């Protein structure tokens, strides 16, 4: 019927016993001390992220899962660059919800754990699973707030987590279903449901040609799947003329590498090479849901990178919208090609800031793995804003260098203005970033290389194995704070 998730903290030195949250304390009282009694009988105390289940304590809650929240006053961890208490809550609540789901319980009430937004994030991110294409599926669990005192915060958590889950769905869906057109249609419907103060333009190939986006076009042509340039507007500012914030995302729905073909092992994960587009578009959907008082534009060039008799050939020179020529030495360095055109187009909006996201390089994965998203930016103010937002969400960012040292290695080009792969194999994420900078003149630009945080195995406790949708929540938080 109905399950209940309650939290308990680690015992502090002067306490005689570990303390329940307010809800746990109230429930124990409701059952005349039976919860504390049974917890004591069960043995060792619950530590952070651990769970234990007690049956039959109340007729309304046949299964009660108690979860360890760790130290009650855990705040910002100076060494980890995140709010520890929030992370403990997300992990603990996710673990509790997965136990409720294993017991095949369709609905669960969740203890706010002193921070309803974090509790909601743990439950909603934790229960998520992409199973539309399977016969065998786990029970669908409906999680709601236990109590009625922390509603806005709980709902805020549901909203943030839902945005990330939308990104996860888009990334996880196989490329034959999640084509450029399909991705555009799903984003279009989600944005329109979020707010009527939106406009969506799924720009066709003819428009792309009119816009002289030769770099983007060169990538798309190898495949039979039609390319599209998704342009979305959210008019949240009270002043329609207020300069917008522009987000740009790499939308390669499937990357085979092209003529510079990839190895077979785990190439299926490349269905998520559109993660950059997924995260920035989902962030905008969420911003619209929150009705943030700001104008935002989202740009996402979308296409496949396939080998064929029409595909990009190593050595080919293409002309970007801005007139710059690019020597395509490696057709698998295609994300930067489509981004060159989208970044150029972004300047036409005279934006306040330009932020792009892309599952750009394997080098980024070798550099930081799934620990944090690499951020390249020409603005310390912007770096700081993204960094502060990440401490709150727990979806960490780490700064990477934008030095001429790297630029020199990409403009040293045999046939053109810029080469699409560096002179050497070193610092691949840095030279890719340098390539992108040659198409940016804006003073507040940030490039997020999310290749290393594309998937999750078990690193983030509250995300099941699969595409991660990171760092969608950090982007939403940045926008929220920016709007305030």
Q: Residues at the annotated binding site?
A: 170-171, 173, 250, 255, 260, 262, 271, 273, 332, 334
Q: Which does 231 bind (CB under 5 to 8 A by kind): Zn ion, a copy of itself, none?
A: none
- What does 273 bind: Zn ion, a copy of itself, none (CB cut-off 5 to 8 Å by kind)? Zn ion
Q: Which two tokens stand for residue 263?
A: 């190895």
72 included as an active-site residue: no
Known catalytic membership, residue 336: yes
CA distance linking residue 211 with residue 321, whole number of Å: 7
Q: Which is nearer to Zn ion, 87 or 255 (CB)?
A: 255
Choosing among Zn ion, a copy of itself, none, which partner's interface includes residue 414 (Cβ < 5 to 8 Å by kind)? a copy of itself
Distance CA 46, CA 56 (A): 20
Given 144, 262, 319, 444, the catalytic residue: 262
Residues composing the chain? 484
Q: Closest separation between CB of residue 135 and a copy of itself, Å?
A: 6
User: At CA 84, angle to CA 81 and CA 89, rounded to 5?
Assistant: 140
For Zn ion, the closer CB: 332 or 477:
332
Buried b (16+ CB within 10 A) or exposed e, 351-380: bbbbbbbbbbbebbbebbebebbbbbbebe
* Alpha-carbon distances, residue 273 vs 25, 33, 82, 167 (angstroms): 47, 53, 27, 12
Write down the catalytic residue from 156, 235, 289, 336.
336
Whose Cβ is closer to Zn ion: residue 36's or residue 271's? 271
Q: Which is nearer to a copy of itself, 212 or 316 (CB)?
A: 316
The minimum distance between CB 174 and Zn ion, in angstroms, equals 7
Q: Find where tokens 């260098």 sit.
A: 401
Return binding residues for Zn(2+): 170-171, 173, 250, 255, 271, 273, 332, 334
CB atoms within 10 A of CB 247: 29
Take residue 285 and report the two structure tokens written for it.
Answer: 């959907």
365 binds, among Zn ion, a copy of itself, none (CB under 5 to 8 A by kind): a copy of itself
* Cβ 148 to a copy of itself shortest distance, Å: 27
Helix residue ranges per DSSP H, 110-220:
116-127, 151-172, 180-194, 205-210, 214-220
> Would you give the DSSP letter of residue 452?
G
Q: How far is the CB of 340 from Zn ion (least distance, A)?
A: 14
Measured from the CB atom, is 244 or 275 closer to a copy of itself? 275
- Cβ count within 10 A of residue 90: 31
Which one-letter DSSP state was computed for residue 263? P
Residues that bind Zn ion (CB under 5 A): 173, 178, 252, 255, 271, 273, 332, 334-335
- Asked if 199 contacts 233 with a C-beta cutoff of 8 angstroms, the reply is yes
User: What's the min distance (Å) between Cβ of 5 and a copy of itself?
Assistant: 16
Residues of the binding site for Mg(2+): 255, 332, 334
Task: Find which of Zn ion, a copy of itself, none residue 134 binds, CB within 5 to 8 Å per kind.
Answer: a copy of itself
Of 211, 393, 427, the C-alpha closest to 319 is 211
Provide the annotated active-site residues. Answer: 262, 336
């Amino acid at each position: 019927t109905k399950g209940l998730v309650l939290g308990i903290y680690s015992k502090e030195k002067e306490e005689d016993e570990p303390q329940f949250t307010s809800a746990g304390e109230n429930f124990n009282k409701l059952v005349s001390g039976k919860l504390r009694e049974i917890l004591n009988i069960s043995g060792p105390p619950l530590k952070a992220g651990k769970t234990r289940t007690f049956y039959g304590l109340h007729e309304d809650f046949p299964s009660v899962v108690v979860v360890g929240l760790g130290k009650k006053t855990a705040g910002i961890d100076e060494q980890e660059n995140w709010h520890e208490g929030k992370e403990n809550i997300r992990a603990a609540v996710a673990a509790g919800c997965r136990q409720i789901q294993d017991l095949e319980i369709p609905s669960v009430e969740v203890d706010p754990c002193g921070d309803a937004q974090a509790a909601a994030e743990g439950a909603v991110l934790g229960l998520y699973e992409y199973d539309d294409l399977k016969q065998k599926r786990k029970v669908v669990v409906s999680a709601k707030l236990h109590g009625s005192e922390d509603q806005e915060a709980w709902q805020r958590g549901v909203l943030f987590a839902s945005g990330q889950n939308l990104a996860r769905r888009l990334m996880e869906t196989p490329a034959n279903e999640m084509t450029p057109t399909k991705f555009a249609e799903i984003v279009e419907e989600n944005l329109k449901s979020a707010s009527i103060k939106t406009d969506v333009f799924i720009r066709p190939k003819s428009w792309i040609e009119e816009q002289e986006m030769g770099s983007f076009l060169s990538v798309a042509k190898g495949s039979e799947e039609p390319p599209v340039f998704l342009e979305i507007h959210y008019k949240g500012s009270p002043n329609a003329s207020e300069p917008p914030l522009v987000f740009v995302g790499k939308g390669i729905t499937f990357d085979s590498g092209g003529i510079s073909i990839k190895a077979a092992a785990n190439m299926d994960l490349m269905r998520a090479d559109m993660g950059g587009a997924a995260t920035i578009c989902s962030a905008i959907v969420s911003a619209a849901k929150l009705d943030l008082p700001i104008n935002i534009v989202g740009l996402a060039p979308l296409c496949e990178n396939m080998p064929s008799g029409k595909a990009n050939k190593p050595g080919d020179v293409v002309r970007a919208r801005n007139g710059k020529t690019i020597q395509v030495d490696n057709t698998d360095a295609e994300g930067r090609l489509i981004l060159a055109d989208a970044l150029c187009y972004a300047h036409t909006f005279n934006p306040k800031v330009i932020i792009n996201a892309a599952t750009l390089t394997g080098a980024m994965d070798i550099a930081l793995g799934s620990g944090a998203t690499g951020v390249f930016t020409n603005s310390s103010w912007l770096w700081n804003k993204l960094f502060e937002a990440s401490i709150e969400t727990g979806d960490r960012v780490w700064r990477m260098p934008l030095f001429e040292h790297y630029t020199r290695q990409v403009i040293d080009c045999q046939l053109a203005d810029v080469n699409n792969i560096g002179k050497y194999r070193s610092a691949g994420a840095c030279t890719a970033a340098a390539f992108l900078k040659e198409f940016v003149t804006h003073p507040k630009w940030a490039h997020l290389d999310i290749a290393g945080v594309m998937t999750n195995k078990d690193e983030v406790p509250y995300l099941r194995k699969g595409m991660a949708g990171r760092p969608t929540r950090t982007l939403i938080e940045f926008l929220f704070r920016f709007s305030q």
